[PDB]
Design a protein around this ligand. Sequence first.
Ligand SMILES: Nc1ncnc2c1ncn2[C@@H]1O[C@H](COP(=O)(O)OP(=O)(O)OP(O)(O)=S)[C@@H](O)[C@H]1O
Ligand SMILES: [Mg+2]
Ligand SMILES: [Zn+2]
Ligand SMILES: [Zn+2]
Lengths: 647, 487
Amino acid sequence: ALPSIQLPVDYNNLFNEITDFLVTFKQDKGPKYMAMLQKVANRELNSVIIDLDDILQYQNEKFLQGTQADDLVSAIQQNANHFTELFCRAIDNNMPLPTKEIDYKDDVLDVILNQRRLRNERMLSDRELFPPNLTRRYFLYFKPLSQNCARRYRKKAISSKPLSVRQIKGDFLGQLITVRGIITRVSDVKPAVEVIAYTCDQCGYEVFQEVNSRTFTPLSECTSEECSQNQTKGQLFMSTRASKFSAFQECKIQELSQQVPVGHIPRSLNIHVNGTLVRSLSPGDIVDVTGIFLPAPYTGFKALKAGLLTETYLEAQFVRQHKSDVEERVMELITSGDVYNRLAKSIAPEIYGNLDVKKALLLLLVGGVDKRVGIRGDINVCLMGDPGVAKSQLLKAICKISPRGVYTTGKGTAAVMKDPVTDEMILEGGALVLADNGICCIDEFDKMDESDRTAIHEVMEQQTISISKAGINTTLNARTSILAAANPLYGRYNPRLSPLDNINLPAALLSRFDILFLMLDIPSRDDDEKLAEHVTYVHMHNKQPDLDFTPVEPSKMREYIAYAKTKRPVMSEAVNDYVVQAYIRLRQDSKREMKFSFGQATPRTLLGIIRLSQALAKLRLADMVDIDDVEEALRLVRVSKESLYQE
Amino acid sequence: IWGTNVSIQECTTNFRNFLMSFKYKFRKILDEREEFINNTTDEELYYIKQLNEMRELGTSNLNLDARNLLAYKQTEDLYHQLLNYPQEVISIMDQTIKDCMVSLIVDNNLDYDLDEIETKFYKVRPYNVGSCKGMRELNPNDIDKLINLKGLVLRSTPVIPDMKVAFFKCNVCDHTMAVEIDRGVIQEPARCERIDCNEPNSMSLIHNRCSFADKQVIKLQETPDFVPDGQTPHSISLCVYDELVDSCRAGDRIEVTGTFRSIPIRANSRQRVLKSLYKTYVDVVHVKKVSITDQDLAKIREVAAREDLYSLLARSIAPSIYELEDVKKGILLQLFGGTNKTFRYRGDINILLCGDPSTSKSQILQYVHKITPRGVYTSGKGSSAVGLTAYITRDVDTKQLVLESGALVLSDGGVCCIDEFDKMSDSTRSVLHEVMEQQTISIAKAGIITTLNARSSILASANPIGSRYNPNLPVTENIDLPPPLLS
DNA sequence: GTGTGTTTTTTTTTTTTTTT
DNA sequence: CACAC
Ligand SMILES: Nc1ncnc2c1ncn2[C@@H]1O[C@H](COP(=O)(O)OP(=O)(O)OP(O)(O)=S)[C@@H](O)[C@H]1O
Ligand SMILES: [Mg+2]
Ligand SMILES: [Zn+2]
Ligand SMILES: [Zn+2]
């Protein structure tokens, strides 16, 4: 038998108070939610977001004038699933008529409604039929409570406190909770059936079957009154036109690194989003997701094998990301702060010296634009440097400041195919394609195999990588700016040894880079002293020794690139003449130098100079490519060339 | 039409009066095309002319643009219903095609077998149905709707036989009856159709005597220029029926139009328990590949009569690359090549491009690869797209031990453009030795012994060792290539 | 009403072995 | 184990 228990919740009074709340709530037009329901009747909205703050304020109001509430905010945090249906029924009861001439060209559900109504009425005179969910063209979600900063938050409002995956104890099942975490895998959008709308071959009847079990069985038997009384035993035909479907996505959110105790392994949680909340998440999202925590069952035969040990998931209800006014602000910064010098230090405020490398980083971040072909607007630099020089910190800073910026080591990109056997998905990404409209910071570029060598090559002269798993020859676009941080082999760099002999990279690939710098450390009396002072101050204050202008936000570079991408600074005829004689004299001095053969001037160096000038004018308004621009670009190029010949 | 409150007769009449009395001038004025001054291509009854062309050619399909229904006045709601209810609309569409064709045959006195027209099934392929919708934006209200999509196909399944008309034979009296099959359900007869036997449960399906149609699921991939950069392009399952089979090889960038439909998947094969996922597909009704002549012979004789045809062709080989006159001449000669003398003589030219690393070495390679009809560009060291040699691999799906061809084979007649020729592996160096000397590739592995005729042309380009080629040093000491292969 | 049928897996990771 | 064949 089924024993009985007594619980003080009073669903009937709660539903009546819910109706009163919806009808008689006016936030500080008429009622806000009646306005939203009217808009839904106008087919202008199909997403009812029930804010907990509104319910709490309504309770606060009516408590002073009758206490006509049962702490609904605390009452629905215990079992939100039932209250979801309660809200749905309340909306249907108080659903306003449409107040707009909405075109009914596609009114298949309305057509079914009126057709079945007429069919029933033509015999009703004798001369619920529809599921409550089927008639709904809307979906209802819950917005969690905000911060209280009051005595009401007396450990209650579990949705206000962001939990972690490890903090989700089994007792929380059925509660409306929230977590803070990072996504790792998002599924595709799929149609999950809400109610099937079978139609019978004879007897003309259509029968609806609501399903929430993740798996069901067809009816295929005309149990309709006419068919049953005639014993025709008609089979039912599933009808997608009249059936109801919902967009569905299944995300797999992991816990943040800070939410993991020492010596432990981060956990994961599956999230089932549906309705209009689909496609609102990506794998690279760190979010605070609030939803209903439900025990997804092993319905079928596996339940018998396993037993009471069920699995859990979160029915998400709300998502909050964490991640020309600014345009006027960046002109203000341009006029006040000298971007060439100030933003150079801003890129690496904690790194002392190597300001010209920082300026090269600014130019790479800006990048040229020569999309027209007959080339490429990606600036690429390699930082061979010297072990012990803060190349890794520079790459980390670039990754943290460059939009779509990714960082990886030479030894860990590439791509993989059908990683999970179950779903058998297609064309998993990598690391190079992640920074498509971004920059890849390749540390340990020397310790990087021939496979990734050819991959990054194909990328750099193609802006696209490709894979040939089974002759599919599918390709993934990666127009990534290449930032390498190799180091000389056998440890410290040898100035006497040739630069290409000091690094185990092919000379052809190295020459195809637009620019390269030797930044090696040499023991001095003062530079080391000032660097030690800088590090000690950073240790003192957890902040840089601010002795100059230190802008923080990188959106200034974003404004510059977005503004000057369309501008496309047109090279002047004088610009072309000056760069052509520059190439002539550069090749002449390269030959007359023939001491290392890497100093030969190439048309690739001309392309690099052109794109550097394009980036220079790109940062400085439009069409700044002139004698001054090419002089600056040639000065930087010659400085880089002499860097290889340092000492 | 059930579920839409739309009469079939009015739609049929609308399309009927849209067939004739409709001119392409309606299309020219619908889009406000300024060049409406054309009369023969506009004021003529374009659909009537298409009917005449079909009658004189005996084809079945019809490539209809959806804009034409907007151009006509009475077929606006027809266009709306086609966008909303493609199945019934297309069915009556093709039925009206057949009826109008037989009526035209009767009226115009054009003598022809009416039974031949009636038996033949005629198709309509409505393209340009709507905007270039993104497959990522496939919200679930598009079920049973005609959808235009753009993308590049990944792969194609082989021909799949789906049973259209059943064939039951009475095992006790040898009575054979055929049952029409709709929605893939078996309406097997209760008893024998012949009265003298009428035995229940006496009918066995004769599988090879049934009627079968061709289904070919394709794997469409979202085009790179429309997919968001952060996420990989997604995939969809195209469905091809009764036509357009093998009309799209793998790797084709196409614009497809078809009805977006989904079907449930059984949770357990033995049971009828159905998973709530409803695997989706699209029933393709049209595909457009968005991507020999007497006048051509006249052009050939004109260019042949030109005195500077040698220099003209040499310049056309690499218009964007300067100098390299003799290089262009040699490449042109290789594209022509010697006569393949039979009785073996190669009748072909092998050319290598040594010298210091130059971008032009690859630029002219891409230019000639574009120029040559056959052959394929390949990086010898890389060989990422093609392995440069034919070998047998296990295809994963069905784990079949299938042979795949290299770049040398299938490049007969044409030029297989090689890059990084010096840096290629020694195994493929020996394979190149075989293909250049014996002109055939001999493979003996996994119980399979075969010889494949390659007969290809070689245009290789290898960079030298060190920073650049040394003119004082010989070619062998700088290119790092075996002397037999070099010679 | 007697008796069935699933759910149900071969990855990644070690260790060996032949070439390379 | 138990619901579906
Ligand atoms: N100019 C500098 N300013 C500030 N910190 C610096 C500077 N040079 C080195 N460092 C410090 O040196 C460390 C970073 O050095 P690394 O980048 O790891 O050396 P490395 O050359 O990359 O060696 P690897 O990793 O083998 S390539 C950090 O602790 C930095 O604080
Ligand atoms: Mg480092
Ligand atoms: Zn029935
Ligand atoms: Zn019989």
